Structures are given as C-alpha cells and as structure tokens.
RNA sequence: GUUACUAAACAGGCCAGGCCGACAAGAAAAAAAAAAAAAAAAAAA
RNA sequence: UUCGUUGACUGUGUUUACCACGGGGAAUUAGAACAGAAUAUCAAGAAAAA
RNA sequence: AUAUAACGGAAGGUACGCCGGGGAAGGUCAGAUAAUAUUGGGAGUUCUAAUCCUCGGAUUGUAUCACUCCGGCUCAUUACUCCCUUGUUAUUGAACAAGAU
C-alpha cells in the first residue's frame, strides 16, 4: 500500500510468432502528463531505454517518470551464415507490442498552476523523445480539474457585473431616463 | 431486465415455470404416458413464450391429452 | 480455430441459383 | 545445424484424430453406432489448453463407454444432447423409438437442454420420449422395404426402393 | 526445542506401472470417472523400505500391547464408534428376535449389520489389526477411553486397566464425554472418501445484536449506529439485486500497464460445490 | 537452517537390544501368537466338545446380559446427542464457529523463522488414575503378571517418554545431515 | 451539484449506430429500473462533458455525474455506465446509462481533485506529491450524487519514508444526511488518497502475482499459450 | 432439431515401442477425514 | 477379512459403427437367438393388545 | 522360429565419357546499406546547428554485401554546381594568402 519501486517484467527468451498487434480495449487514462501512441507498432528495448534516459535527463533527478510498457516479446533473425529454410532464426531483440492509444511514458505530478489556465503544459521531454520513436505520439495532460471549479468563469462573471454597473452609473449620471 | 413477479405465476396446474432453462413447460398425456413440452424464452421472448405455452395447453385440452390414463 | 459466420452485409443480400451464369427464367 | 523433426515431410502423421461427435441431434441410430469418438491419451497441462478436443463428453441414457472412451449407442432411437450445469459437460442420450417419419412438430424432443443431475437427465429423457416399449405407438409413415445393402457390395444404395417388396420391420423396437 | 524451523518433508514417491510414458495420467478428476478412468498403481510397485526394527519391531511391540489389552476391547471400541455415528437421535428399543419379548439389541449397529449381512468373522479380522495403518492408529488412540482422553494415554503404563475394567457406567461416561468433545465442523480434504461423511452441524440464520442501556429513555438500544436502511440491508443480506460492479481496487494503481481484463484460463473450470454448513429451517 | 525429525539409536538403545535378542524376540512372538498349539493336521485339538460347549454357553449368557444392560446407556446417549445437536443449531451464527471446534482445538502452527490456553487433559481424570488403587487391589495373579508385562513393553516401546519432554531438541536434525543417511 | 440537464431526440425504429453517428450524434441506451429506452445526443454537447479538459481524454466526472436527459415528455435521471470511445481521438461512439432511483444503491466512482497544490508544504520543499486514487467508490442512495471530493494538502508535510492522506481524512466530506458513503470494503484508516515522498528513495517490490503481460494477449482477449509454459518468467 | 471435424512448411518443440497368472485380471465386500497434539514406521481398503 | 475364481471359455448364425483397399485392428451392439461348460450373487424373515 | 525398425514388409569413380530430357548475368525485393534533412548525444577555449563524429525515426533510392549463350583495346552515350575554372559582397572559428561547408 505504501509507495514502491516495482521490478520490471523480465524478457521472455521463448521463440514466438511474429503475429499481429491486437487493438486496445479502450482509452488509457492516467493523471499527470502522458505520451500516448497514435498508431500500432512494436517498440524495441533500446528505443524505450533511450527515451527513458532522455526523459530523466531533461526533467531532472527530482522528478520521477514511469515507463508504462516493457519490451518482453522476442523477435528472431537469421545469422548471415545460415541457408534459407533451416528453421526459424535465433532470438535477435525484444519488443513491446504497443497498440494505438497505449501510454509509453507518464509523469504523475499534477499541474500546480490551476489559477493560470493560459499557461499550457510543458512537453519538453516528450518533444525531445517523440521524433525518435517508431510510433506517432500525442501529448496529454489530465489533472482532474473540472469546469465547475474554473476560476476564469468567476473572473468573467465579475467583469460582466462591473461592466453592467458602469453602464448603470453612466446612464444615471447623464439622466436621460427615469 | 425489469419484470413484474406475477409473470412467473401459472394459471393451470399443467403449465409450470422451469427456471433452470427459463422455459414454460406444458404437461400432457400421449400413448399411455406422461410428456412435457418446453417453450423457451430464448426462443419466443418473454411474453410470447408464455402465450404459446397457453395456446399449446388449449390445443392439448381439445385433443383430450390432459386426461390421466387408467389401467 | 472455428470460422465465425459473417452477419452484417456489405452490399446486398446474397442469393443462390442453380446453373452457370446465363439468361434464365425471370 | 538444424534438427529436422521426425514429423516433417514426408513422414508426417497420415491420419488425424477426428475427435468429437459423429451423430447430430435427432439422428436415428441403432446399437453399435459410435455417437462420439474419443481417446484415452490426455495432454500434460490440460487445464490450460483451449482446443475443443481435450474436453470429453459424457454418456447418458442408452449410451455406453468404449475401451478408448468412445460413446456408443445401445438402443434403436434418436440422438439427444444435454448440458450438465453442475459438471459443465455435454451428455449424449438416445431416446428409444422405432423408425418413422421425423416430423417438424416433433423436433422439440431433441433440443439440447440444461440439467443439474443425471437423475434429472433421465427424467427429461422420459418426458421427451415418444412412447414406451410395452404400449408402443401408431407409427407415422414407417419404412417398409429392406435395409441398405452391405457397404462392401455397394456404398450408394437407395433408401426405400419402391421396386423392392415390403418386408416386416421387426428389429427397431429392441 | 518445541519451537523449531521445521522442514517440509519430501513427498513420498507414489509408484507407477512402467507403461504409458507419453500420456498424462494425473488428471484431477474424481474416481471413478466414466470417461476419465484413473490408472491404478499396483501395491507390489509402491516403493517401501526394507523391514527393520523401526517399522517391524515397533509393530510387534504394539501388537503385543494389543494382545495384552485383549482384542475384545478393540472390538468394543469399534462397535461403540459405529453405533454412535448412527444413533444420534432417539430410537425405539430394538430386540434381535421377533418373539424374544425380553432381549434387547444394544444399538442400531444391529440394523446396519443385518442390512449389510456383515461378516462376524470380518469384525474379528479387523480387530486383529493385520494392516499398517490399523497398527499405527492403535499406537495413537489405542486407549479404550480415547473418545474422552484422545492420545493422552498413548504412553501411559497402566493403560490396560481401562481395557480390563472400563465397563457399564464408565463406558457411558466415555461416550458422553466423547459426544461433547468431538469435532462437528466441515472436513476439508482433497483425498477420496467413500463412507458416510461425519455430520456437520447446521448454522442458525440470524446473528446476535449488541444492546446497551440508555437512561435517557430507560431502554436498551442497539450499539451499532443507524446508517441508511439500504446500507443496513447491504451489510446484512448481501450485495442486493442480481448484478453489481466488482469490488473496487484496494491497492494503489500500478505504474506499469497490465492486461487485467484477461481471464486466468481460456476455458474456466466447472463451479465448485458448497461444502460449508447448511442453514437451519 | 531447517530440521527434520529423527531418533538416533543411542537414545533408544534399550528397544534395539530388546528386539535384537533372540530369546526376547521368541518370547514376544509367543505372546503375540499365544497359544502356540499346532493347527495344520486334522488331529490337532486345543479343546474338547464339552469344554467348548460350556465356553459357548457362558459366552452367550455374557453377551445377552451385557446387551440387556448397556442398552439403557445407549438410549440415554442417543437422547443426549440429540439435545447437543439441537443446542448447537439453536446457537447464533456468531458463536457457531466456536461451538463446533472440539476440545483439542488449537490455531494452525506457523513456521516463522476463544482459544485462551492450550488443551491439557488433567491426568487425575484418567480412569486408571481415578481407580488405579482399587482395581490393583482387586486384580488376580495372572492379571498382575499381565499388567507387569504391559508396563515393560510400554517402557520398551517408549524409553524416551520423559527424555523427549526434557530435551526435545535432541530429536531434530538438519536436512543436509538427515537426508544423507542410508536405511 | 454536478447534475446536468440534457436534450435528446429519438433513436428511431430502423436507424443504426453508424447512421446516428454520421448524423453528428451519439447513440445512447438508458436501462435498469424500467424499460430500455434508446436515444441520440448531440455529439458536441455530449463530448463537451465527456472530454471537459482541453488536453485530457475521458473525464472521470463523466461516469460520476447525474444526467437529466429529456426525451419527448419524459425525463431520464441516470448515470453513464458504459462508454465506447476512441482510444486516441476524443470521440464518443456509444453510451449506456443506468437509471438512478432514490432509495437504491448506486455504485459511483466519484473523482478527487487537488486544486490547492500551491499551498502544500511538501510540494514547496521540492518533494513529489501524487494523487494516488483518481476516484473513490461510493454507494449513493440519495436524490443527488456527491460532487468531486476536494483533497486539501495545505497541511501535508513530508517526513520519511512518506506521508499519506487517507480516506478517513476525507470522511468528513460526505453528506450529513447519510445519503452517501464510501464502499464498505474500504479500510478508511489505510486507504491512501494522496502521497508525498522523495523521488529515488522508494523501497523495491516484486511484480504483483496478478500481473498479466500485455505483450502476450491474443486478439480474442485471452492469454497466449506460451504464458502457461514452465519457463515463462512473468 | 442442431456449431461440432480439421497442425501445411527442414514451422515452434515430445516420445520410454516397455508392465501384469495377479495385494497388477477380478465376483462379493471394503476403502483414503479440518486444526492441534502424540509417534518419527514414507501406509486407505 | 487375512474372503472366491480363472469368462485372459469351446462352438453355430455374414448382420452392424468407420471406410480408396488391406489390419470390423485407437481397438463399434446383448448381431439381445442357439448348443455346452464354469464362476460369483439368491429371495423371504409381516403382525408387540386392553 | 524367422528377416523385413527404410516398420503397406543400402559398394564406389569417371576432368575419357555417351544417349534422351530440362536449363541459371538480368527482372523483382529492400535486411545491411546510399542520399536528404531531422532528433538525442559527443567534439569544437567559451558555443547544439562555422565545422566534425555517432544514434534513433522519416521519405526517397539500389553502388556494394546478404529469365540466356574477369581484365584490357576501340568507339563512346547519359546523369550529378560534379575534380579545375563562376556567384564583386552566402556562412565561416572570413585580417591577407592558402582554405572549409
Ligand atoms: S485409555 Fe485413557 S483414560 Fe482410559
């Protein structure tokens, strides 16, 4: 129940079919900032590790980043010294079979600047890593801030009340109406 | 679904609600023996299964197959 | 392993007839 | 250095198991007809498998179990299937009847149904059965010609040849 | 000492016929499945250690002790157990003859023995303890008074006095103590059984409610708070309605993604029967 | 480490010598298979017609009287059991769990590295303890010899009844030292 | 509180989901405690509530609001219970509502909100403050649904190994009339709604036994056969 | 009435081809007990 | 029970599930009949006044 | 009892060869790889873009590696601001000169 640093799933050293990447059951929602795949693809362990290192370097030691998927699915390739048709090749790499709509990385820190709605999110690390992923990506930020708590609505209502009051005083002072 | 409890009440002793199969079973006598024909909800729907069971009961009554064989 | 029948249609309802394509009874 | 499996070409397995039912519902059968083919060999992690072969069916009314666990008929009748909710298995029964026309109004007797116990399975078989041996019934369009010829003579005989003479049917009540 | 880091003993090697090496003979079905027959292991192939003083001499000593105590005591204990398990309600007195008019039977053991045509010689054969488990059980509960004293007498040196002179009122005391001291809950085993299962007590429907006095009204009132009637019904009778959402997650959301919607096995096993206590009418 | 139960020969020297001595083995076997009269030939009789007729008459009388006597106890026990089960059924569901646990109940053991106290049967409640002196004073000569032999064989079977209580640690040894011993 | 009145039009007798979708609407079915009633809701209006965060996907408030759909002369007071929406795009495909009736338990996952993070001592000291539980399960029997739960962190100081705001702290936010409560299965004293801890200091834990590797799932929603091998490390 | 057969590739791997005249065929009969304790005998008939 | 036993029989009858054929042989029926021999198991035991 | 376990039941060479029949440098593919920029990183006193090295993804492309009857000479044809020659005055870590992209 306390916070923990769960160990990563291990690499399965079992030959498996190339197969197809099944679709996502539904939207994946996580508070904070998320980088979400937009098309299906299989991301290599090297690519995931590079993205993690870049995210850590950009954000800093004081901030924590969660890698949502892991490369456990084996993928094989033949040695150049083997002829055609002599069975499947040796394991060559490991991949995560990311569908469309799957979060790759996310940071759970909520945006503190609720009263500054015009300051839109900082996606610096996501921008740094996106052009290197083999998947198109979309940047998301969800902070559980609902419009019922919006401060801009109160600001607008106050401005409207002030305007109405000003027009009322101007009319009264000029005295063209009862 | 939402259904009134009076649906499962049968108006005749030979018409029974079987809840395992959710079917209306109608009893009758044929060839000096006792038989039961089921009318499933999965087949007819909620109201129509009961309606068809009642119609089959009337058919068996006309055929005289509701009478107890005697030896 | 089972092949599952396709239920919704793409176009028109299928219709089967005897014999090869030709002008036939109408 | 690739180890070619023994079951590679040309020495693969010629004949497949073909495990499963061999007669559908409402079909007419006589003693000795194999209703379901099954095998004794069992997989080593059966509870994790998903193919339908590994999960056998169960005998019911007028059905025996063979040496290799095939389900075979024991009386002249029509096939029926049942689902055992308690054990979550399929049960094969044969309702005894003499050969006669299979009418549309009688097809409900061979529906697959859910039961909780084999006692209820027997009760349902009695309730759907057409008639009892000691009382019989009026046969509706029963066959009157001799049976199909032996397979080794002709595989494609004709059923109820009008040119053949009527012969008594005195075997389908046993 | 008494407290120790005990090692789990290695399983005993069940033998097997040297055949059928390509098949799985260890399906989890119940004897005697019509379509999943179980392969037998001949008793001549079960690996057993050579007989020495640890397994043979001990049996000889226990057999000598039983001989001294008399096979009649063992016969009487077995008869009393069998009659007690079947006479847990008031019976009418039963005579062994149609016209005796004076002789009484001594238990429903009579009815069972007559119905099964049980072997008078067989009872003596059982009491003579020809089997390893029988001798092991006598070494553990061999005392005549076991229904009341359990294994406490397993090492007592004047134990034969019970067998020699525990009769009549003392036998009645043993039985009455045993009836109160015996277990009456659910037995939980995966091993095969073929005898009439021992009784499990039925459980009453209602629970007990705690009540404390309140002088503001001079009356006793329930300790538990009020809550909404719907909440009370949910807490008492269960989830209510035929369908509800699953239990909410009680652990912090995992940082990694896992396919938690996937069922454990492609084809789930059949439902398990309720072995617990039944309700009271 | 983790230990396994064991009983070394040194701590049980007495029973090993008892069972390895030929004469003591012969005496024990004779006691087990007493009497030792032959039973193969047709002419082997350990009794006589009149003797076994009188024995049968006495046995039949004894069994008849015992069945006539103990039947009242059996009926009373049946009624008592009925009452006990009725009371258990009448108990509330909260107390049901405790009311079916038997005297010897104890929570499950944990191999770490309504239950107030352990179950202990008062030794003063054992039948032979309560009436030991009277029965002993009323025994016969053969019964006294039987009691002596029963004692001696009990001691032979359990030379270490007190030693196990005193030093239970002597009967538990590590796996790596126990499993490596031949039978 | 967060109840929303909405206007709908009929899902007519031969139209399909795809037709209503291409007509610029979302197909919805209201069920439970009455007849199954079909309707269509203007997609812009519905998606405004469903995706009320400019950079966010489906909002936890969607399945926790009380909708007041109006069809013809009827008013359906219900809650969204099933939502088919696009994994990537902010598109609503299909909706299934279940009616809410005063007196019967409705199982609603009411969301949590931390608007006062700038007043948190732990956050100002540079430590990581996390909202662990986006929603809290509640059993509601009243005529209204509780609004989102405000988690106040102005007194959340950091002490090793971590500090937590648990459900007992929020217990005071429930209605005074007792029309709503936290799920009884919750242990209020140990169910943590918020954490404050230091990055890089957490203890190690093994992967949960209920973990299912998403790389070995077939298109049918079943585990691949390789997951049952003796050598499968996960 | 009624949804069940079905492993092609030098595809991803398995194989022990054997036992029993009987506690291994087998009539009748019998058959494996929660927790804890005792015993340290791999033990249901 | 520490219980018997040898049907792990001798023959007559061309009918039967499956199907390229062969090996009715992954291993089907009481072909419910007939001529011999053998092994195990029976059933019944109802009626206890005032 | 018997061998058929190849389980419907074990000598080699021919570049001296012969007869009958049939034919693999392309066409195609795009793994490495080539071009272009781009992302991350490392060099360049300081400096991510004067300039250099390397990594991932993207588009385009086929120099090298993984369907017939080598090299040189002679004569050549076409593409690429391309090796020298041009853009006074692009940029330069461009004083000039010699240079670099
Ligand atoms: S045997 Fe224990 S008191 Fe009698």
TrEMBL record, chain A:
Listed GO biological process terms: mitochondrial translation
Entry protein name: Putative 50S ribosomal protein L16
One cellular component term from this protein's GO annotations in UniProt: mitochondrial large ribosomal subunit
Keyword Ribonucleoprotein tagged: yes
Region (Disordered): 157-178
Pfam families xrefs: Ribosomal_L16
Organismal lineage: Eukaryota, Sar, Alveolata, Apicomplexa, Conoidasida
Keyword tags: Ribonucleoprotein, Ribosomal protein
InterPro entries: Ribosomal_uL16, Ribosomal_uL16_bact-type, Ribosomal_uL16_dom, Ribosomal_uL16_sf
Alphabetical list of Gene3D superfamilies matching this protein: Ribosomal protein L10e/L16 (3.90.1170.10)
UniProt keyword Phosphoprotein present: no
Provenance organism: Toxoplasma gondii
Entry's Gene Ontology molecular function annotations: rRNA binding; structural constituent of ribosome
Family, as annotated: Belongs to the universal ribosomal protein uL16 family.
TrEMBL record, chain D:
Protein name (database record): Uncharacterized protein
Naturally occurring in which organism (per UniProt): Toxoplasma gondii (strain ATCC 50611 / Me49)
Organism lineage string: Eukaryota, Sar, Alveolata, Apicomplexa, Conoidasida
Residues of the full protein shown: 218 to 391 of 391
TrEMBL record, chain E:
Stretches with biased composition (Polar residues): 86-102
Region (Disordered): 84-105
Biased composition (Pro residues): 265-274
Protein name: Uncharacterized protein
Record lineage: Eukaryota, Sar, Alveolata, Apicomplexa, Conoidasida
Automatic annotation (TrEMBL), chain G:
GO cellular component terms, A-Z: cytosolic large ribosomal subunit
BP terms from Gene Ontology: translation
UniProt KW Transmembrane helix keyword: yes
Domain of life: Eukaryota
Keywords: Membrane, Transmembrane, Transmembrane helix
Presence of keyword Membrane: yes
MF-aspect GO terms: 5S rRNA binding; structural constituent of ribosome
Designated name of the protein: Ribosomal l25 family protein
Taxonomic source organism: Toxoplasma gondii (strain ATCC 50611 / Me49)
Residue range from the parent sequence: 506 to 739 of 739
């Amino acid at each position: 129940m306390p916070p923990f640093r769960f160990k990563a799933p291990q690499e399965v050293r079992i030959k498996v079919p190339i197969g197809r990447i099944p679709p996502a059951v539904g939207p994946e929602i996580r508070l904070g900032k998320s980088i979400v795949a937009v098309a299906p693809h299989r991301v290599t362990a090297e690519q995931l590790e590079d993205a993690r290192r870049v995210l850590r370097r950009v954000l800093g030691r004081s901030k924590e980043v969660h890698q949502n998927v892991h490369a456990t699915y084996a993928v094989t390739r033949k040695p150049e010294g083997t002829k055609m048709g002599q069975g499947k090749g040796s394991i060559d790499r490991f991949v995560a079979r990311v569908p469309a709509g799957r979060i790759l990385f996310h940071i759970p820190q909520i945006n503190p600047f609720h009263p500054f709605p015009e300051v839109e999110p900082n996606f610096a690390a996501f921008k740094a890593i996106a052009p290197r992923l083999p998947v198109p990506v979309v940047f998301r930020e969800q902070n559980n801030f609902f419009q019922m708590h919006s401060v801009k609505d109160l600001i607008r209502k106050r401005q409207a009340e002030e305007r109405e009051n000003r027009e009322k005083t101007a009319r009264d002072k000029l005295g063209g109406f009862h | 679904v939402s259904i009134h409890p009076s649906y499962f009440e049968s108006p005749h002793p030979f018409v029974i609600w079987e809840p395992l199969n959710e079917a209306w079973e109608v009893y009758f006598y044929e060839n000096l023996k006792k038989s039961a024909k089921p009318f499933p909800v999965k087949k007819f729907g909620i109201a129509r299964a009961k309606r068809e069971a009642l119609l089959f009961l009337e058919q068996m009554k006309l055929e005289g197959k509701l009478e107890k064989p005697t030896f | 392993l089972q092949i599952y029948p396709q239920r919704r249609v793409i176009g028109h309802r299928i219709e089967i007839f005897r014999g090869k394509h030709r002008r036939r009874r109408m | 250095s690739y180890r070619r499996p023994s079951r590679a070409s040309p020495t693969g397995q010629a004949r497949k198991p073909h495990v499963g039912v061999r007669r559908l519902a409402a079909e007419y059968v006589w003693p000795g007809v194999v209703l379901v083919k099954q095998r004794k060999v069992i997989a080593f992690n059966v509870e994790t498998k998903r193919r339908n072969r590994h999960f056998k069916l169960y005998p019911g009314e007028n059905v025996k179990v063979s040496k290799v666990t095939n389900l075979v008929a024991l009386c002249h009748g029509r096939v029926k299937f049942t689902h055992d909710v308690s054990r979550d298995v399929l049960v094969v029964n044969v309702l005894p009847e003499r050969r006669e026309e299979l009418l549309r109004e009688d097809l409900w007797r061979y529906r697959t149904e859910h039961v909780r116990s084999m006692e209820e399975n027997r009760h349902i078989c009695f309730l759907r059965r057409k008639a009892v041996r000691m009382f019989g019934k009026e046969l509706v369009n029963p066959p009157t010609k001799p049976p199909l010829r032996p397979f080794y003579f002709t595989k494609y005989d004709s059923w109820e040849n009008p040119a053949l003479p009527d012969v008594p049917q005195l075997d389908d009540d046993m | 000492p008494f407290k120790i880091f005990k090692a789990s003993p290695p399983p005993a090697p069940t033998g097997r016929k040297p055949t059928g090496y390509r098949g799985n003979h260890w399906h989890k079905k119940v004897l005697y499945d019509p379509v999943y027959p179980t392969t037998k292991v001949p008793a001549a192939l079960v690996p057993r250690y050579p007989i020495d003083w640890r397994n043979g001499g001990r049996a000889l000593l226990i057999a000598a002790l039983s001989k001294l105590e008399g096979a009649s005591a063992l016969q009487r204990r077995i008869f009393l157990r069998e009659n007690s398990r079947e006479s847990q309600v008031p019976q009418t007195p039963l005579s062994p003859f149609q016209t005796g008019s004076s002789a009484s039977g001594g238990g429903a053991y009579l009815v069972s023995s007559l119905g099964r045509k049980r072997s008078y010689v067989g009872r003596i054969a059982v009491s003579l303890m020809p089997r390893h488990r029988q001798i092991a059980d006598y070494q553990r509960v061999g005392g005549f008074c076991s229904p009341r004293c359990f294994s406490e007498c397993s090492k007592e040196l004047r134990r034969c006095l019970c067998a020699w002179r525990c009769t009549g009122f003392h036998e009645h005391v043993v039985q009455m103590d045993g009836m109160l001291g015996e277990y009456k809950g659910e037995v939980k085993t995966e091993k095969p059984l073929f005898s009439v299962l021992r009784r499990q007590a039925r459980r009453n429907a209602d629970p007990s409610e705690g009540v404390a006095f309140c002088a503001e009204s001079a009356k006793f009132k329930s300790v538990r708070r009020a809550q909404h009637p719907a909440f009370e019904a949910f807490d008492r009778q269960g989830p209510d309605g035929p369908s509800q959402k699953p239990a909410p997650r009680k652990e912090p959301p995992l940082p990694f993604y896992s396919a938690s919607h996937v069922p454990n096995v492609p084809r789930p096993p059949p439902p398990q029967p309720y072995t617990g206590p039944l309700k009271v009418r | 480490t983790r230990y396994l139960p064991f009983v070394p020969t040194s701590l049980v020297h007495e029973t090993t010598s008892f069972l390895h001595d030929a004469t003591k083995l012969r005496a024990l076997l004779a006691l087990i298979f007493s009497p030792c009269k032959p039973e193969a030939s047709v002419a082997d009789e350990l009794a006589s017609p009149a003797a076994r007729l009188e024995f049968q008459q006495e046995k039949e009388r004894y069994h008849a009287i015992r069945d006539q006597h103990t039947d009242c106890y059996r009926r009373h026990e049946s009624a008592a059991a009925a009452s006990m089960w009725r009371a258990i059924e009448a108990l509330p569901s909260d107390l049901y769990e405790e009311a079916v646990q038997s005297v010897t109940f104890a929570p499950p053991y944990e191999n770490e590295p309504f239950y107030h106290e352990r179950f202990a049967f008062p030794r003063a409640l054992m039948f032979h303890e309560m009436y030991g002196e009277q029965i002993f004073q009323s025994l016969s000569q053969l019964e006294r010899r039987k009691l002596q032999v029963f004692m001696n064989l009990m001691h032979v079977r359990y030379p270490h009844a007190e030693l196990k209580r005193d030093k239970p640690a002597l009967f538990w040894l590590p796996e790596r030292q126990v499993l490596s011993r031949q039978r | 509180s967060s109840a929303v009145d909405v206007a709908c039009k009929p899902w007519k007798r031969f139209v399909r989901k795809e037709d209503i979708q291409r007509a610029g609407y979302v197909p919805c079915i209201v069920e439970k405690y009455g007849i199954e009633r079909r309707l269509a809701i203007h997609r812009d209006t519905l998606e405004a509530l469903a995706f009320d965060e400019q950079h966010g996907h489906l909002s936890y408030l969607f399945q926790a609001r009380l909708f007041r759909l109006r069809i013809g002369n009827w008013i359906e007071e219900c809650i969204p219970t099933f939502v088919q929406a696009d994994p990537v795009a902010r598109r609503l495909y299909f909706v299934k509502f279940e009616r809410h009736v005063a007196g019967k338990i409705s199982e609603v996952d009411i969301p949590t909100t931390m608007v006062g993070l700038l007043a948190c001592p732990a956050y100002q000291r540079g430590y990581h403050v996390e909202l662990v539980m986006p929603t809290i399960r509640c059993q509601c029997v009243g005529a209204e649904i509780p609004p989102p739960f405000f988690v106040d962190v102005s007194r959340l100081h950091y002490s090793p190994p971590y500090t937590a705001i648990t459900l007992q702290d929020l217990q005071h936010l429930l209605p005074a009339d007792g029309s709503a409560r936290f799920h009884p299965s919750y242990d209020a004293a140990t169910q943590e709604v918020a954490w404050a801890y230091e990055v890089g200091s957490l203890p190690d834990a093994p992967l949960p036994a209920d973990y299912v590797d998403p790389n070995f799932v077939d298109r049918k929603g079943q585990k691949m056969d390789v997951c049952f091998r003796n050598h499968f490390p996960n």
